[PDB]
Amino acid sequence: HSPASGRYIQQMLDQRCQEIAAELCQSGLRKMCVPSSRIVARNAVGITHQNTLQWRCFDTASLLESNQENNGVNCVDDCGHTIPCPGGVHRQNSNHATRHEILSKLVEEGVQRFCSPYQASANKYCNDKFPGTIARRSKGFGNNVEVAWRCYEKASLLYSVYAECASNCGTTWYCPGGRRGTSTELDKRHYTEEEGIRQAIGSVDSPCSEVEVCLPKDENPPLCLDE
Ligand SMILES: CC(=O)N[C@H]1[C@H]([C@H](O)[C@H](O)CO)O[C@@](OC[C@H]2O[C@@H](O)[C@H](O)[C@@H](O)[C@H]2O)(C(=O)O)C[C@@H]1O
Ligand SMILES: [Cl-]
Ligand SMILES: [Cl-]
């Protein structure tokens, strides 16, 4: 067991999408008759005129290796936040099935099971103060060593990079969506909020007695062990 998110919500979305592609194929939709290694869920734009961010089931063979403007794909952390992950949508040639309602409902279900109350609290602090941001302890602009608690705009995070987050005991944990400390415009898009985030984390009630030891887990609740 690593002290890290299992990315269980994302895993549930991809499985549900593999099921939907298999049903579509059975319905005659030939382009969806693929092995399950070819299907993932992404939160993204679709083809031309599909311009909002929706949960869709994509054939990875139709995804671009990288994105230009508004066409990147997003994956989801175990608190239900969407974060850039590798790939881009081909606006003419994408092979996908938009399934926003079922996939959103699985995200809400997963958030109840997996999202650390301590992380929920830190994310809420960030969102209230800077709409759209989530909390990580990670890199800032042009410095690839130093970490601090910051409210990060989700578009500036990288799902493939794990960064420190709060476990469900309020202890060190690592979650997808991190910074590299590089020097691009995206690397500027955060608000360092060391005191406010730490207080938000500290205000959460322990799931354990003041005499028990909280051992965190990648799904709620953590272990409470007698001292
Ligand atoms: C421009 C942007 O999106 N984020 C800035 C961020 C914000 O301007 C700030 O948090 C707004 O409240 O500031 C960052 O620098 C913090 C740093 O800023 C200096 O001006 C000051 O000298 C320092 O005391 C300190 O506040 C941040 O990390 O928060 C940079 C970020 O790019
Ligand atoms: Cl997570
Ligand atoms: Cl749906």
From Swiss-Prot:
This protein's record includes keyword ATP-binding: no
Impact upon substituting residue 98 to A: Abolishes binding to host cell surface. Reduces binding to fetuin, a host glycoprotein, ability to activate host bone marrow-derived macrophages and dendritic cells and virulence in mice
UniProt-recorded Gene Ontology molecular function terms: carbohydrate binding; host cell surface binding; sialic acid binding; Toll-like receptor 2 binding; Toll-like receptor 4 binding
Cysteine-cysteine disulfides: 17-57, 25-33, 75-85, 79-115, 126-151, 165-175, 169-214, 208-224
Keywords: Cell adhesion, Cytoplasmic vesicle, Disulfide bond, Host endosome, Immunity, Lectin, Signal, Virulence
Localization, UniProt: Cytoplasmic vesicle, Secretory vesicle, Microneme; Host early endosome
Region (Beta-finger region that is required for the interaction with and correct trafficking of MIC4) location: 209-227
MAR domain: region residues: 1-227
Region (Interaction with host sialylated oligosaccharide chains): 96-98, 188-192
Stated name of the protein: Micronemal protein 1
Native source organism of the sequence: Toxoplasma gondii
Full-sequence range covered: 29 to 255 of 456
